[PDB]
Design a protein around this ligand. Structure first.
Ligand SMILES: C[S@@](=O)CC[C@H](N)C(=O)O
Lengths: 142, 148
């Protein structure tokens, strides 16, 4: 076995759990920072064209640059960003940290408007902390 | 908790990976310290009778009491310990630590003798460390009236 593949299977199980337990969560994935770029390493839902994201691009980049939650309750009334899927109406990006710094993120899309409450935020923050040591196996610094 | 149930599914997925990816690993479980006793919170394999374990003489206790890996190469030929399964010939218990202190463990049985090498030990220590926050969601400190 391998610690990277072990971490992948945990991150995959977490995506699966979050999707199955929350009716409104339509797509769930973990992006990790590798050589300055965000790379998708685990997900559940339909396939995304955006497997690698250069920074500056979107809610995904923004969560890492501000080092905080970005919760967009109406993706489609926000003329400064496009989701990856046409059905998506809200999206939340939660940072995963190592020694206080973002190394990755959990990214979730809902087909419903304003899907993510402040209670979702607190829970997802808690999950990000709990998964951090796992997600870190994928981090490759600049 | 929603988080406890999330943690339990992570631990469960970890036991499944451990058992599927390692041919000698026949039973995998996470025991967690809850009010000063070990409680099995996730496992893959055959049912065990040892769901709650008082701090005692077994390998499961030893890892927590010594705070170190306990690796029995030959269970049947150790007349001081009994396994949970008659097929077991080797067993390793790896402490799960949170802030330097043991809060639980990973217990693995093999039907083969001397199943657990130094490589296994080191990989399982790493695994235990990566899983610790999650196992910690089940951790509960023993608190008696006289403590405060
Ligand atoms: C795969 S999709 O959830 C990633 C792109 C993200 N919507 C963004 O706004 O950055």
């Amino acid at each position: 076995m391998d610690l990277k593949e072990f971490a992948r299977s945990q991150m995959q199980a977490a995506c699966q759990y979050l999707k199955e337990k929350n009716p409104k969560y339509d797509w769930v994935g973990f992006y990790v920072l590798e050589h300055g770029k965000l790379k998708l390493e685990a997900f559940v839902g339909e396939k995304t064209d955006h497997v690698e994201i250069n920074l500056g691009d979107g809610l995904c980049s923004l969560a890492v640059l501000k080092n905080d939650i970005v919760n967009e309750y109406d993706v489609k009334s926000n003329p400064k960003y496009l989701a990856s899927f046409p059905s998506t109406q809200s999206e939340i990006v939660v940072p995963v940290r190592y020694q206080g710094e973002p190394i990755g993120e959990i990214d979730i899309d809902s087909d419903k408007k304003a899907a993510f409450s402040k209670e979702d935020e607190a829970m997802l923050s808690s999950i990000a902390d709990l998964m951090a040591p796992l997600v870190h196996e994928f981090f490759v610094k600049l």
